[PDB]
Design a binder for this molecule. Structure first.
Ligand SMILES: C=CCn1c(=O)c2cnc(Nc3ccc(N4CCN(C)CC4)cc3)nc2n1-c1cccc(C(C)(C)O)n1
Ligand SMILES: [Zn+2]
Length: 294
């Protein structure tokens, strides 16, 4: 195939980026740490080859991604720093969040402490409040696209199943792609709007507090059959205030779920300790939020 260049030049802004460390795959894309050859500032670079964009519909999805993502500015959204092309590749330059994602945390720590879940879910909801205010649905919020910066703030990225909503009342009849925490109105093909991201946040909330995802089996279609039936069980050691918020979010009817603006007014947040920050040791060891050291 075409090999990816070591220095990526944009002719319009006049920048050269050094391509550095590889970070992972995602579909047609490969992701690298990339850095400006003059100013040394480091970015995440999404690189898609044009060999995988030979059909117009795949180009249109790449255009829609860039269109959505470049219109976003928020503390809890991965910041878009530009896009460029060559004859073989599409390049997008994004905020590099150095502490990976909530998925890498989840694999190390399993279930988190309630204050940590409450911390991360607040910032997830704050970033999703930005999106829904701007009429963007994300549609694929998962642990592996909620990226953690060096301070341990959540950054929503990966706008590649995202969509704008163009008129009030609009149900999208189609979702091209397979989101991880797929909502029941998507699975049945009934039609969907903003509620799909609240569903996702409920599955994230379940996963962070329980340590395993809510519907999972060995078969993805039996998992979809469970989502269709609402076949899940919150274990009895989960606090009822948190289990109540999970149950509100993971309802099979979209219109019964809370809207994103309501979430932070829930009793789960408003009667719990929400840390102002978490230290780097929370990636490794469960915090024991002590009132004095020793
Ligand atoms: C640029 C493309 C999209 N995306 C982002 O917006 C983004 C932002 N920050 C990051 N940070 C990041 C930092 C380090 C690492 N790695 C460090 C070394 N680990 C062993 C493996 C993972 C990993 C990430 N990484 C980011 N991206 C990213 C990077 C790898 C994989 C994926 C998806 C979700 C598409 O699979 N997305
Ligand atoms: Zn399609």
């Amino acid at each position: 195939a075409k090999e990816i260049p070591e220095v990526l030049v944009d002719p319009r802004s006049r920048r050269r980026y050094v391509r550095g460390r590889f970070l992972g795959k995602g579909g047609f894309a490969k992701c690298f740490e990339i850095s400006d050859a003059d100013t040394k500032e480091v970015f995440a670079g999404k690189i898609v080859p044009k060999s995988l964009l030979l059909k117009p519909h795949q180009r249109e999805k790449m255009s829609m991604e860039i269109s959505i993502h470049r219109s976003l500015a928020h503390q809890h959204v991965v910041g878009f720093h530009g896009f460029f092309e060559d004859n073989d590749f599409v390049f997008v330059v994004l905020e590099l969040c150095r502490r990976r994602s909530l998925l890498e945390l989840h694999k190390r720590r399993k279930a988190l402490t309630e204050p940590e879940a409450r911390y991360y879910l607040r910032q997830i909801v704050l970033g999703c409040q930005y999106l829904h205010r701007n009429r963007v649905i994300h549609r694929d919020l998962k642990l592996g696209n909620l990226f953690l910066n060096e301070d341990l703030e959540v950054k929503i990225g990966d706008f590649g199943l995202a969509t704008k909503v163009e008129y009030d009342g609009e149900r999208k009849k189609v979702l091209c792609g397979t989101p991880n925490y797929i909502a029941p109105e998507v699975l049945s093909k009934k039609g969907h709007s903003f509620e799909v991201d609240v569903w996702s946040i409920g599955c994230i909330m379940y996963t962070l507090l329980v340590g395993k995802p809510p519907f999972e089996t060995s078969c993805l279609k039996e998992t979809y059959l469970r989502i269709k039936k609402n076949e899940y069980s919150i274990p009895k050691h989960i606090n009822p205030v948190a289990a109540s918020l999970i149950q509100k979010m993971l309802q099979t009817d979209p219109t019964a779920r809370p809207t994103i603006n309501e979430l932070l007014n829930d009793e789960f947040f408003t009667s719990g300790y929400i840390p102002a920050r978490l230290p780097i040791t929370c990636l490794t060891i469960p915090p024991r939020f002590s009132i004095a050291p020793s």
